[PDB]
Amino acid sequence: VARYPPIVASMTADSKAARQRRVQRWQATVHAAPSVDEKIRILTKMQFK
Amino acid sequence: LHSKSSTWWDEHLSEENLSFVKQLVSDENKTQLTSKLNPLKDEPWPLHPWEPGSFRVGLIALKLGMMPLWTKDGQKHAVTLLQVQDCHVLKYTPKEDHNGKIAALTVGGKTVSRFYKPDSRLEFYRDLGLPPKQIHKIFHVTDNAVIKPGTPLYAAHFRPGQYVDVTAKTIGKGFQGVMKRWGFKGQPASHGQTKTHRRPGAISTGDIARVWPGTKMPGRMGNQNRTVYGLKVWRVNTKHNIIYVNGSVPGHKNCLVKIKDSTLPAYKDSCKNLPFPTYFPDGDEEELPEDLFDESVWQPSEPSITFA
Amino acid sequence: AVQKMTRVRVVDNSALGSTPYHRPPRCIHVYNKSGVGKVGDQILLAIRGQKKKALIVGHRMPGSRMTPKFDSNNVVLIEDNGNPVGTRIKIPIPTSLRRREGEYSKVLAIAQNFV
Amino acid sequence: ISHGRVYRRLGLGPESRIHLLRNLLTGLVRHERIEATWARADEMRGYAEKLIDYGKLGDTNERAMRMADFWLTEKDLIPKLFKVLAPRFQGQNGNYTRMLQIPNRKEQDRAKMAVIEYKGNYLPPLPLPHRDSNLTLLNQLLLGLQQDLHHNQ
Amino acid sequence: RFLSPEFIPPRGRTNPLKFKIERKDMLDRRKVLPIPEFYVGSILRVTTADPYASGKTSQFLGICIKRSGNGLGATFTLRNTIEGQGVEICFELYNPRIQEIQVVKLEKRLDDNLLYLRDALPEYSTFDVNMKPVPQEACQEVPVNKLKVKMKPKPWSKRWERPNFNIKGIRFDLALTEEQMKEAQKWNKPWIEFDMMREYDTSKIEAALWEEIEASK
Amino acid sequence: AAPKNRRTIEVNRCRRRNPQKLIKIKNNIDICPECGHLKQKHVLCGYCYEKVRQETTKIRQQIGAQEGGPFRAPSVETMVLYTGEKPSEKDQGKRIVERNIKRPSWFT
RNA sequence: GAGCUACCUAAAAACAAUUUUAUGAAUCAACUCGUCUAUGUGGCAAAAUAGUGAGAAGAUUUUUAGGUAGAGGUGAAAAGCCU
Ligand SMILES: [Mg+2]
Numbered sequence A: 001v002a003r004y005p006p007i008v009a010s011m012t013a014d015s016k017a018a019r020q021r022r023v024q025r026w027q028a029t030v031h032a033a034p035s036v037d038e039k040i041r042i043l044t045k046m047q048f049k
Numbered sequence B: 001l002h003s004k005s006s007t008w009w010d011e012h013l014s015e016e017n018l019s020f021v022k023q024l025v026s027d028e029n030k031t032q033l034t035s036k037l038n039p040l041k042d043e044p045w046p047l048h049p050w051e052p053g054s055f056r057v058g059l060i061a062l063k064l065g066m067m068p069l070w071t072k073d074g075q076k077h078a079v080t081l082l083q084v085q086d087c088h089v090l091k092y093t094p095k096e097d098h099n100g101k102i103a104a105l106t107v108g109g110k111t112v113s114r115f116y117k118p119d120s121r122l123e124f125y126r127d128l129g130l131p132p133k134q135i136h137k138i139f140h141v142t143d144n145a146v147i148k149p150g151t152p153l154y155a156a157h158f159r160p161g162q163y164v165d166v167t168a169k170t171i172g173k174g175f176q177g178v179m180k181r182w183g184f185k186g187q188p189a190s191h192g193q194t195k196t197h198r199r200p201g202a203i204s205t206g207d208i209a210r211v212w213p214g215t216k217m218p219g220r221m222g223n224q225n226r227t228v229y230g231l232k233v234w235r236v237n238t239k240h241n242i243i244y245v246n247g248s249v250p251g252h253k254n255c256l257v258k259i260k261d262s263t264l265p266a267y268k269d270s271c272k273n274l275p276f277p278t279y280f281p282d283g284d285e286e287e288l289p290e291d292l293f294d295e296s297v298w299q300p301s302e303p304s305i306t307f308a
Numbered sequence C: 001a002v003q004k005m006t007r008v009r010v011v012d013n014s015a016l017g018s019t020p021y022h023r024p025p026r027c028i029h030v031y032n033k034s035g036v037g038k039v040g041d042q043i044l045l046a047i048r049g050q051k052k053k054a055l056i057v058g059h060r061m062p063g064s065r066m067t068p069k070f071d072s073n074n075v076v077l078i079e080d081n082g083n084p085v086g087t088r089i090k091i092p093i094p095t096s097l098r099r100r101e102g103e104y105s106k107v108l109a110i111a112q113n114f115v
Numbered sequence D: 001i002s003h004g005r006v007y008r009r010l011g012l013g014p015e016s017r018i019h020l021l022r023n024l025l026t027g028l029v030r031h032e033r034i035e036a037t038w039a040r041a042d043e044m045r046g047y048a049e050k051l052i053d054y055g056k057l058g059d060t061n062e063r064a065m066r067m068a069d070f071w072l073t074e075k076d077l078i079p080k081l082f083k084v085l086a087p088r089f090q091g092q093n094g095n096y097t098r099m100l101q102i103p104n105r106k107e108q109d110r111a112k113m114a115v116i117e118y119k120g121n122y123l124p125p126l127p128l129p130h131r132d133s134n135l136t137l138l139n140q141l142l143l144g145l146q147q148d149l150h151h152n153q
Numbered sequence E: 001r002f003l004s005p006e007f008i009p010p011r012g013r014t015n016p017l018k019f020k021i022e023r024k025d026m027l028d029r030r031k032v033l034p035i036p037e038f039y040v041g042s043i044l045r046v047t048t049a050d051p052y053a054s055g056k057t058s059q060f061l062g063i064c065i066k067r068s069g070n071g072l073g074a075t076f077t078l079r080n081t082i083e084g085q086g087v088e089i090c091f092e093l094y095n096p097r098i099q100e101i102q103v104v105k106l107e108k109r110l111d112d113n114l115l116y117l118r119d120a121l122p123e124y125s126t127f128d129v130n131m132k133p134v135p136q137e138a139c140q141e142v143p144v145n146k147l148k149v150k151m152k153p154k155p156w157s158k159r160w161e162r163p164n165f166n167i168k169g170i171r172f173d174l175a176l177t178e179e180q181m182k183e184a185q186k187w188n189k190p191w192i193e194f195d196m197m198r199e200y201d202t203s204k205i206e207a208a209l210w211e212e213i214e215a216s217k
Numbered sequence F: 001a002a003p004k005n006r007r008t009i010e011v012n013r014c015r016r017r018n019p020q021k022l023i024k025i026k027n028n029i030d031i032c033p034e035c036g037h038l039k040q041k042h043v044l045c046g047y048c049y050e051k052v053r054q055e056t057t058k059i060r061q062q063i064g065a066q067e068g069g070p071f072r073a074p075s076v077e078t079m080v081l082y083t084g085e086k087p088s089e090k091d092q093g094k095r096i097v098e099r100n101i102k103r104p105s106w107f108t
Numbered sequence G: 001g002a003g004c005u006a007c008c009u010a011a012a013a014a015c016a017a018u019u020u021u022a023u024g025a026a027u028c029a030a031c032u033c034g035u036c037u038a039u040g041u042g043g044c045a046a047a048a049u050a051g052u053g054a055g056a057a058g059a060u061u062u063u064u065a066g067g068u069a070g071a072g073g074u075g076a077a078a079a080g081c082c083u
């Protein structure tokens, strides 16, 4: 019964896998967002070309 | 190529020889040490009696460390442990050639390896028939107290009670500033002192247009031969050749020292009671106890001190 | 280490100093070749616009082994002639004062306790 | 004034020194042969061996598991350390890592280098130094002496 | 097996021969005077002869707040408050003028040091002078008293809230606001607990010492 | 502080040609038994060492292709096999890295 | 030569949270400024950096274009500014 740490990429590392995990964190906030208007706000609050 | 090459003992030795060589040398050291274990049965020089004005030889010991000690008055005295290791007299110069009024003997200690020594040093020790010693020192000894070269020396040369003097190189602290080296006060940290906190003040007088020789300036501190005088001998451990010397002794732990009979005026004639040339256990005149104590010292396992 | 300007506790019963009012007495002079004053060392104390000689009976600085280190700097007021000002000293007083060079028997008689 | 201070001063401070060694160690625990400047490789060597000591303790031990996490940034290597590195070294009690000095770097930095590895690795064997054979002139003479002495003994 | 802390040598370049000599002297004294087992936080009564007095001894009772020293120089400090006056005395284990050492209450506390009691309320350091010894069970684990003391106003002799001390026996919440506690963590130094070269392993030494110590018996 | 006089080439030639400022010759250079290239006694031979590292890179590249991911390190023992070699019974259950080239002489 | 800077005209823009109230009031960011100490001193800098400080809905700050030119211009006057 060895409670190994999960085999996942680091959150704060400067790597593609680490970047992808940070992306999942952002998407989590949308999933747990209570209302639709808050869902839309989180998705589109940042403007890129 | 056709040029000078660098080499060491291990460069060529094979795997099997490597262990054999490191073992053969160890066997030889034991045999050589045993050969000199009996001074009095090896054509000893005449043992003249003591008379006033005599000066004995002294030992070279390794500084093991420090430990506390108590006297029957209840006071605690910090005492240091000095171990005599393979202390053998090496060379005997005569009065005239020594350039001093007194004769001089060389007393080496602390046997060391043979693989990293200059050929000249090994040749000298081979003739003497003893393993090489880490350090050499010279003791001024009167003609009456001369000891034949190669005579082993032990901690029984001293006894409890005798004041003794120890000298060794001080711990090297490297290049240091004027404040730490000589205890200069220095300058204040605040109130406007700009880039001047630990610097020396005015070097000298302006008019002389120069700095006096010997001025106290930043430089390397420590690693200088120094001596401590009037250090009582509290106890002598015959089995391990450990002498208990009062107070602090110069040098780092495991540093070789030069123990010698004290030169202070009060201790002028303290050698008379002790063995005049030295103590030879091989003589077996008397069997000494393992631990020798001084009268004031409170030995362990005795009843607890009561200040009645 | 009692020095100049140190606020000190007058562990005594003298009305002049034992009463709990005014700023804590401050040390003005230490009767030693060195500035630092330890147990059994006289000091000059300024109390209520007056200069009174006192005696140190304890201090907060660590001492030699088997010695009592107090949690406050304690001092005892002593008259110029040597007789202590206070008539009683209930807080424990270290017994080392007996063998220290000086006159301390008077204080020991006043001090009922001993540590 | 740094007598008895075993540690070096590396990185931007004490914590940085710990985090640079965690990266060489993780690379070593992952590749089993890593290169670095002699000073930094030698600094890690003490840390490299002590991981095997914790690995020997076993998975169940909580302290070994916790330590194996701080000192292994990548988390796919804790299973390896416990289940292949540790079993290999059970017989031995020391000398887990082999360190040798590679020539100076050809970078215009010209820094001293060393290669550190784990013994028994699958990678091609390092060009280790070779001592002379017993048949060589000097070696053969010593063997003759050994035989003579063995007979005398 | 309770090995007295002083027996374990500290690491360094000192030769073992120095420790061997000290142990032999220490063991000899233990035969004359038995040093009972005690840990920081236990209440002790120590009888010592007074050099100033003529054929008269003295006793001091207090809680052991610190254990320090190695070999024959081992010392321990036990504290108590008398007549509202706090007193601390540093005692040497092997001083020849100690007649007896008594463990009034054998117990362990959450912390390896109780120096912070200076900033605690007076009650937490006051102990009755004549308190009688409590019964003790050898075939048990030493009782661990988990009392968390209450502190006096914030200005303390030392910054006990700071992470370096690692005090686990103070009720910080009553005395310190949560914002202050977060500020203390700026000095945490988390890396120290996970560097494998700061650990001094004495498993073999402790086993080796125990045999020799038991061998003397 | 600024120079009070120009320093002559004779004085300059005394300072920069001092023995303390010259290159000290190296006495620890030897010839590698295998390849014959030069090496220092206390250092490995770069020419021989380069062969080992070049093979190491090829083996490591092959390993990377098989795993195909960052966190794919296998707990089980690793092993490298070259063409013409088949795993033994004792080598069962060990990751195998296949190399097209023949077994190098130094590799055993 | 008023793209710096003093002043003015025109067209514009910025000011979160908190408490007062209904404001050249308060705490304090963005932002404006430049009391103090320290470092720097051929400096990162021909006036900066690190801290510490003052104002921050107003006589506020900022942007864009234009106007006033040396016997002069501008000036909440320091004989201050006008590359
Ligand atoms: Mg990115």
Ligand SMILES: [Mg+2]
Binding pocket: B185, B186, B187, B188, B189
């Ligand atoms: Mg100063």
Ligand SMILES: [Mg+2]
Binding pocket: B189, B193, B194, B195, B196, B197
């Ligand atoms: Mg300064």
Ligand SMILES: [Mg+2]
Binding pocket: B172, B173, B174, D001, D002, D003
């Ligand atoms: Mg040094």
Ligand SMILES: [Mg+2]
Binding pocket: D002, D003, D004, D005
């Ligand atoms: Mg060093």
Ligand SMILES: [Mg+2]
Binding pocket: none
């Ligand atoms: Mg200490």
Ligand SMILES: [Mg+2]
Binding pocket: E157
């Ligand atoms: Mg303090």
Ligand SMILES: [Mg+2]
Binding pocket: none
């Ligand atoms: Mg304009």
Ligand SMILES: [Mg+2]
Binding pocket: G006
């Ligand atoms: Mg204006």
Ligand SMILES: [Mg+2]
Binding pocket: G015
């Ligand atoms: Mg607003």
Ligand SMILES: [Mg+2]
Binding pocket: G033
């Ligand atoms: Mg301004």
Ligand SMILES: [Mg+2]
Binding pocket: none
């Ligand atoms: Mg303000």
Ligand SMILES: [Mg+2]
Binding pocket: none
């Ligand atoms: Mg205001």
Ligand SMILES: [Mg+2]
Binding pocket: none
């Ligand atoms: Mg306002």
Ligand SMILES: [Mg+2]
Binding pocket: G077
């Ligand atoms: Mg004016």
Ligand SMILES: [Mg+2]
Binding pocket: G083
């Ligand atoms: Mg101009």
Ligand SMILES: [Zn+2]
Binding pocket: F032, F033, F034, F035, F036, F037, F045, F046, F047, F048, F049
């Ligand atoms: Zn080669």
